Design a protein around this ligand. Structure first.
Ligand SMILES: [K+]
Ligand SMILES: [K+]
Ligand SMILES: [K+]
Ligand SMILES: [K+]
Ligand SMILES: [Mg+2]
Ligand SMILES: [Mg+2]
Ligand SMILES: [Mg+2]
Ligand SMILES: [Mg+2]
Ligand SMILES: [Mg+2]
Ligand SMILES: [Mg+2]
Ligand SMILES: [Mg+2]
Ligand SMILES: [Mg+2]
Ligand SMILES: [Mg+2]
Ligand SMILES: [Mg+2]
Ligand SMILES: [Mg+2]
Ligand code: NA
Ligand code: NA
Lengths: 61, 130, 183, 71, 141
RNA sequence: AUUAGGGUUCGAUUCCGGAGAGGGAGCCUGAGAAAUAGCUACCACUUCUACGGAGGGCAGCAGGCGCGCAAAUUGCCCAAUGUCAAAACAAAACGAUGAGGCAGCGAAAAGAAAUAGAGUUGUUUGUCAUUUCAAUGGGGGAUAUUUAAACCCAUCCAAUAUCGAGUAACAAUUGGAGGACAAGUCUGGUGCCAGCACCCGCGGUAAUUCCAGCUCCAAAAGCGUAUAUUAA
């Protein structure tokens, strides 16, 4: 069957452990709404015929 | 802008009422203290209200339930003043009299008096409480 | 146990949680009007729905119906006094076309900014939150205070606030104590 | 009501036929109710006749009405 | 086609009464055969004791082994098979331990490729199986 | 509760009506009871005893054990509301009240709302590194207010004289990022395994779905999951 009860947690262990990097706090409450709003409508401009990619990633493979 | 001024209090009465039933005059008193660090104590209002309505003694003035306005500078509360001090001693509750200073001593624990009754009911007469 | 006071609700979540058109439109109302979350908008939506539903009922009855004549006249007074509807718009059909931005236009946080008191709508909210504004010489500490038209000329700084007839604020007070102690 | 049965002694059974309205379906349905009524020897009604009855005190286990007319 | 008479309400009432029993959702909510067969007895959750660990071969086209346990409830004493909602959680649960069980989300219906499993383990030893998995809380003994 | 309308569903639960006081059944008194913090008997349980005998009925309040997926303190007080009473209050002279009121615990649920507001310089706007500026609350207290007394809220930081925010560390979480459904050509391993996945599906060595970081998304002092129910 190629699977077994003894194989449990295999990938959990396989995955090597990596720590989380440190980070400063972000604004909370009305500040976050007004901080994101300036990114949505003020930090950039809308060009007709082009859609805004809300979280684009660097190229790779 | 802002200037240093002496703290002042203004006294106004609303819905003045006269009743002979308890020998007292009842009204609602509003307090205007624009520059007052805190809230006006009732002892001061008693002297101002005694002076305003020209009663021989301040201790016949009963003021209670003074609730303050939001934002500050104003406090309102109910108050009745009696024709004589003796009538005030006769017609006043124990908690209000104690607040002035004439209230009777506080009764013992109600749990004890409750327990004391149930001990007695199990015994014959003259053997209950000695 | 035998407690007898109502506690109703004032808002409702949207039926479709993820609409790009609705999320972007609501985010525009947040920054443009300075709201902490979307519940203020949903409170406004429920406020506007209720006037719309009762108006819808009133227009079905004849104009001589006593219920229409009384409740129709009342809802006009509620719209005009709170500034929701323009005073020359006297018909009952103009209540139907009321809009969400009209309701937030009458919020104190909006009116404070629009009167020149607050340079920004976010300045207005915190300024109201800091007991700095009095309407008809009564301190208001609540951004969602819908103001009447007849009380618009009475908007000012509170006489207790540092900006006005009141004592100095915290910073001018704590630092002064520091200098006196250092003596 | 209408005299339904005269098989007892000094007593008759009457039927009160009516229509009951079902609100959901917006329609009526035929319903009937039976009553035991005391009939005096002054009347002598027959099956299918029409009578007027009036409420009195309990006269028996089931009788609470008395015949007043026969039509 | 149906009746349309003004005084035909009795027929229309019986028509709906007889034909409501063809609604599987309505019939299930108005009969006791579903509650008598339901191990939880009409409740959301139920505690139990672990008997043994079993691996269920997932349905086609999936090919895996799903960690599962045989559990006996304490209010009915009936055999069920539950599921451990993450990986490396079969080691955390040990035989003869108190597990709080819940439904799989489909109201008495098998979920996913697990063949005959309608329940999932939510708690172990009065501690959440999620917090135990997240290395956030520790189980006693 | 939900609902365009018609409807569907819930109602042990605060007001009204009924019933019961472990299960049954009888009865005295009384205007009124088939009364149960009244009596009598039997069945189940039960406690004290000097063994002769005598006691018990929390589906009242407060509180235990079991049952369970599952639910507060053996707290204060008659100050309000009422009940009874031989009875206004007062004066040697102050009635009872676990009814009730007021607090403790309490993320069932509901309303208002924090976590910051502006700048000068450099890097049409806009981000970032600076320089600062004023303000309020959380909180600490009081001449004191509230309150039967308290606690809470409201007032104030001297009126001659009243403390405090810069990483304003007084540091916001819960699920997700193939589709439904807002959000990634980033990962890295496993290699139809470990797993995810409400449904469709992902995983067989360059994983769209697995197990993490960043970013981003959605809601936000709230957010998942299970089971019912209403709409759909
Ligand atoms: K309600
Ligand atoms: K007789
Ligand atoms: K009742
Ligand atoms: K991921
Ligand atoms: Mg009912
Ligand atoms: Mg029941
Ligand atoms: Mg009874
Ligand atoms: Mg019992
Ligand atoms: Mg009895
Ligand atoms: Mg009892
Ligand atoms: Mg008994
Ligand atoms: Mg109890
Ligand atoms: Mg990869
Ligand atoms: Mg779901
Ligand atoms: Mg439905
Ligand atoms: Na597969
Ligand atoms: Na398979």
């Amino acid at each position: 069957i190629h699977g077994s009860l003894a194989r449990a947690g295999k990938v959990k262990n396989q995955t090597p452990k990596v720590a989380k990097q440190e980070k400063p706090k972000q604004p909370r409450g009305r500040a976050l709404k007004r901080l994101k709003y300036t990114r949505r409508f003020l930090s950039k401009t809308v060009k007709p015929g082009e859609k805004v990619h809300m979280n684009k990633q660097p190229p790779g493979k | 802008v802002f200037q240093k001024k002496k703290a002042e209090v203004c006294i106004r009465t609303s819905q003045f009422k006269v009743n002979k039933l308890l020998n007292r005059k009842q009204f609602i008193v509003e307090v205007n203290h624009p520059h007052w660090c805190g809230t006006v104590p009732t002892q001061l209002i008693r002297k101002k209200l005694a002076t305003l309505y020209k009663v021989p003694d301040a201790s016949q003035v009963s003021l209670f339930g003074f609730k303050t306005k939001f934002g500050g500078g104003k406090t309102t509360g109910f108050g009745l003043i009696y024709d004589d001090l003796a009538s005030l001693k006769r017609f006043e509750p124990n908690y209000r009299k104690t607040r002035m200073g004439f209230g009777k001593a506080r009764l013992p624990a109600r749990k004890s008096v409750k327990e004391r009754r149930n001990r007695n009911k199990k015994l014959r007469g003259k053997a209950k409480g000695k | 146990m035998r407690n007898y006071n109502n506690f109703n609700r004032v808002w409702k979540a949207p039926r479709r949680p993820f609409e790009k058109e609705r999320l972007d439109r609501e985010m525009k109302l947040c920054g443009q009007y300075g709201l902490r979350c979307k519940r203020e908008i949903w409170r406004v939506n429920m406020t506007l729905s209720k006037m719309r539903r009762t108006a819808r009922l009133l227009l079905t009855l004849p104009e001589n119906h006593p219920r229409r004549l009384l409740e129709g006249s009342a809802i006009m007074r509620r719209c005009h006094e709170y500034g929701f509807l323009d005073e020359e718009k006297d018909k009952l059909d103009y209540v139907l076309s009321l809009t969400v931005p009209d309701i937030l236009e009458r919020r104190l946080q909006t009116i404070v900014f629009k009167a020149g008191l607050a340079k920004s709508v976010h300045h207005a909210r915190v300024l109201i939150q800091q007991r700095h504004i009095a309407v008809a010489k009564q301190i208001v500490t609540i951004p969602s205070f819908i103001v009447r038209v007849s009380s618009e000329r009475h908007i000012a700084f509170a006489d207790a606030s540092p900006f006005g007839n009141g004592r100095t604020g915290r910073v001018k007070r704590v630092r002064a104590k520091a200098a006196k102690r250092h003596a | 009501g209408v005299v339904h049965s005269t098989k007892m002694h000094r007593t008759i059974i009457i039927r009160r036929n009516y229509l009951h309205f079902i609100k959901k379906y917006q329609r009526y349905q035929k319903r009937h109710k039976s009553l035991a009524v005391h009939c005096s020897p002054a009347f002598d009604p027959k099956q299918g006749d029409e009578v007027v009855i009036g409420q009195c005190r309990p006269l028996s286990k089931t009788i609470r009405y008395n015949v007043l007319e026969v039509v | 086609t149906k009746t349309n008479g003004q005084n035909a309400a009795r027929k229309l009432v019986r028509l709906r009464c007889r034909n409501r029993w063809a609604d599987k959702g309505w019939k299930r909510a108005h009969t006791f055969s579903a509650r008598k067969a339901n191990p939880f007895g009409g409740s959301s959750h139920a505690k139990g004791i672990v008997l043994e660990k079993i691996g269920v071969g997932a349905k086609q086209p999936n090919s895996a082994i799903r960690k599962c346990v045989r559990v006996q409830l304490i209010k009915n004493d009936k055999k069920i098979i539950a599921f451990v909602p993450n990986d490396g959680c079969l080691h955390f649960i040990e035989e003869n331990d108190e597990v709080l069980v819940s439904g799989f989300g489909r109201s008495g219906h098998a979920v996913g490729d697990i063949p005959g499993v309608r329940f999932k383990i939510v708690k172990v030893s009065n501690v959440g199986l999620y917090a135990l998995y997240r290395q956030k809380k520790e189980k006693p003994r």
